[PDB]
Amino acid sequence: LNPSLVISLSTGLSLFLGRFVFFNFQRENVAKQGLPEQNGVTHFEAGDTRAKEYVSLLKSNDPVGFNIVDVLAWGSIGHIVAYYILATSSNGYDPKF
Amino acid sequence: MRDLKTYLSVAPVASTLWFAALAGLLIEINRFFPDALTFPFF
Amino acid sequence: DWMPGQPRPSYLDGSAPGDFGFDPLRLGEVPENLERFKESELIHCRWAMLAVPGILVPEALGLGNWVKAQEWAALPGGQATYLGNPVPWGTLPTILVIEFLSIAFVEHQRSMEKDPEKKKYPGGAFDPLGYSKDPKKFHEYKIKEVKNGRLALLAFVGICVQQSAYPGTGPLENLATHLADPWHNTIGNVLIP
Amino acid sequence: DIAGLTPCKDSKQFAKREKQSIKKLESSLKLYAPDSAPALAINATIEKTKRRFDNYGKQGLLCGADGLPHLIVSGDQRHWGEFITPGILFLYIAGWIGWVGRSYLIAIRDDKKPTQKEIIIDVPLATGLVFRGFSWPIAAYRELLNGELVAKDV
Amino acid sequence: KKGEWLPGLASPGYLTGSLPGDNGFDPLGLAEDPENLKWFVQAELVNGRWAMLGVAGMLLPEVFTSIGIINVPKWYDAGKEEYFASSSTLFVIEFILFHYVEIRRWQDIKNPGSVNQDPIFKQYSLPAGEVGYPGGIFNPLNFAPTLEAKEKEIANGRLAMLAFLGFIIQHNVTGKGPFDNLLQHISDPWHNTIVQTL
Ligand code: CLA
Ligand SMILES: CC(/C=C/C=C(C)/C=C/[C@@]12O[C@]1(C)C[C@@H](O)CC2(C)C)=C\C=C\C=C(C)\C=C\C=C(C)\C=C\[C@@]12O[C@]1(C)C[C@@H](O)CC2(C)C
Ligand SMILES: CC1=C(/C=C/C(C)=C/C=C/C(C)=C\C=C/C=C(C)/C=C/C=C(C)/C=C/C2=C(C)CCCC2(C)C)C(C)(C)CCC1
Ligand SMILES: CC1=C(/C=C/C(C)=C/C=CC(/C)=C/C=C/C=C(C)\C=C\C=C(C)\C=C\C2=C(C)CCCC2(C)C)C(C)(C)CCC1
Secondary structure (H helix, E strand, O other): OOHHHHHHHHHHHHHHHHHHOOHHHHHHHHHHHOOOEEOOEEOHHHOOHHHOOOHHHHOOOOOOOOOHHHHHHHHHHHHHHHHHHHHHHHOOOOOOO | OHHHHHHHOEHHHHHHHHHHHHHHHHHHHHHHOOOOOOOOOO | OOOOOOOOOOOOOOOOOOOOOOOOOOOOOOHHHHHHHHHHHHHHHHHHHHHHHHHHHHHHOOOOOOOHHHOHHHOOOOOOEEOOEEOOOOOHHHHHHHHHHHHHHHHHHHHOOOOOHHHHOOOHHHOOOOOOOOHHHHHHHHHHHHHHHHHHHHHHHHHHHHHHHOOOOOHHHHHHHHHHOOOOOOOHHHHOO | OHHHOEEOOOOHHHHHHHHHHHHHHHHHHOOOOOOOHHHHHHHHHHHHHHHHHHHHHHHOOEEOOOOOEEOOOOOOHHHHHHHHHHHHHHHHHHHHHHHHHHHHHHHHHHOOOOOHHHHEOOHHHHHHHHHHHHOHHHHHHHHHHOOOOOOOOO | OOOOOOOOOOOOOOOOOOOOOOOOOOOOOOOOOHHHHHHHHHHHHHHHHHHHHHHHHHHHHHHHHHHOOOOOOOOOOOOOOOOOOOHHHHHHHHHHHHHHHHHHHHHHHHOOOOOOEOOOOOOOEOOOOEOOEOOHHHOOOOOOOOHHHHHHHHHHHHHHHHHHHHHHHHHHHOOOOHHHHHHHHHHOHHHOOHHHHO
């Protein structure tokens, strides 16, 4: 009901899940999938300057590598689910058994 | 006789005789049970 | 052998616990698929075995059937009831989030393993009584586990299909109505209305 | 009833169409002599029409708002006589034809000049072969199971 | 002399008289393949045995009730008479039992000898007989399975199958049991035949 409470709780919980539960799984999957490549070379290696990975802002001081991009991602997931909860709880819709 | 049989079994002649017989059979079946739109026996 | 007189698949010898050569569709042809299949089978068997008593025991008591006990959630004021008393945190969004989080964490922790024998039979913290000491007695326990698990899976299938056949009834109710008049009240009326 | 249609026996537009058809046929009859060959032919046609409509009502066909019979082919057991048992009959006859022709082709495939027996049909062999189509449903089934219906190596 | 179904016609080569009842009758050539012949012999055995049992069941009760000993209904209408159990219950029980026994028979047919053993009591196995002819417990009186008796079985089964076909067609066209038809024909054979029936 209280939008701030629900949003903050859900976002913090999603960040906790990303940081402590699914962290290693996601890192392993992104490692094994790798960068997108064309004709065997990555997009940057083919001459696409803008395809270069932004190595600057991706690095972090977190012990395990939790950086900016994944805080954005997990917080976005948390907010999406939080607003789904809020809208659906205040919608007043009721199915009939 | 033998050559008459041979020519009488050549594709066109055999086909025309077969189709004449089939047409006659179907015509008689329709005549006995005309205007049949379903199979009512079972 | 699952079928006296039918030749057995080559990749199923009979050494695995519960191997009876049943694989008509030959799904376990590839060994790396067969290992995952074995783990999945044990997980399903364990869930069904831990569930079926859960479907039956509360029904035997003065509570509703397995489908009525999970109908309170469809109401605007849904609130759960355990052993005849209303639980406090019974409202749906709670139960839902707590269950999702606990199950996700436990399942991920389970999947973070690559033995792959402890993948199916982990042990340690999950074997307090320590029944896995004698390697051959452990094998017969494995056989009994898989057999009872398959039986429980079949029982759960029967429960669900009965529920579909007669909506709003429970397995014990079906058993009681069968015992009331065996011959007339059977599956036949369902098969041939 | 099914698809909002009504039985032809109790339908009204069906009866109206029946009456109109008979009226149209009778209109021509009154012109000729009462007992001439054209009059007899027209009377026979009228009787045929009456019998047809009575039979359609009898078999229990469904009639739409147009007043014409409609065929249900969904599989309803009340209408298997409309498409399913005629369908089975057609499948039997067509498989008879195809199996007999295939048997002939396979039989004549071993000669040095098979084409000669194709433009000039070897009737003696054909008369023996045509009767295999009585039991082709079994011959084809065992042909498939035995694995030689379909040409391997292709 | 293997028995000729057409004195003037030679018998097919694939038929050699080894099988009981081999009279060389196969105009359509349905057994050109040894495997097809091996399957069809078992099919004929089982069909004939079922036909014999069924025709006996339809005939004997009818004549017995006609002469006045038991009061059973006709075979065609015997389905309505209400028994101690619902019809569907009886059907499903029969389905289970037959689904077991017929699969046992099938396993015997596919690879002979693999199902001669009782699956519950490890002893009590069937004597190593031949497909379609499983002796042992199925033959308590132990009548000799001599070849001549097998031919008699085959002939009686063929007669029974013909008789069942006649039973059903006569009931469809006339509308009563076969024995009533025979009695009516005997009363006046020259005015009670298929011609007058049709
Ligand atoms: C999801 C449950 C599950 C799974 C994953 C397995 C997996 C396995 N089983 Mg098992 N089994 C099960 C349930 C299961 N079983 C049940 C319920 C029974 C009792 C009927 C058995 C009885 C059984 C025997 C007797 C044997 C096996 C064996 C095996 C292994 C080899 C067969 C194989 O590779 O196919 C893999 C199987 C699957 C991928 C599951 C198929 C799922 C498909 C897609 C859907 C099935 C449709 C189903 C009929 C729907 C019913 C619905 C209802 C309305 C009726 C394998 C590891 C053999 C073995 O060697 O054991 C080690 C063996 O002999 N099973
Ligand atoms: C199985 C069978 C009958 C079984 C009957 C049963 C169980 C009846 C049961 C009941 O009655 C009771 C007891 C009590 C009743 O109240 C109820 C019912 C339920 C009704 C008959 C088979 C009957 C089978 C028949 C008639 C088969 C005929 C086959 C023929 C003629 C084939 C001939 C040829 O095949 C050859 C041999 C060679 C080929 O090359 C050429 C051709 C010509 C094709
Ligand atoms: C320092 C640190 C810490 C902490 C920290 C924090 C707490 C922070 C943060 C943060 C956060 C917490 C973040 C977040 C998030 C993010 C983002 C980036 C997001 C998002 C979302 C979105 C964007 C959405 C949108 C939408 C829309 C608009 C539409 C509709 C609705 C929705 C929702 C869908 C600690 C002490 C623990 C430890 C050490 C380190
Ligand atoms: C029931 C029905 C229906 C439907 C159905 C369906 C949809 C199904 C199917 C089907 C299918 C899916 C089929 C298939 C097939 C396949 C294949 C693969 C095959 C084959 C065959 C062959 C190949 C043959 C050959 C031959 C013969 C045998 C004949 C003659 C000779 C020859 C050689 C030609 C409907 C509803 C409409 C209506 C009603 C009826």
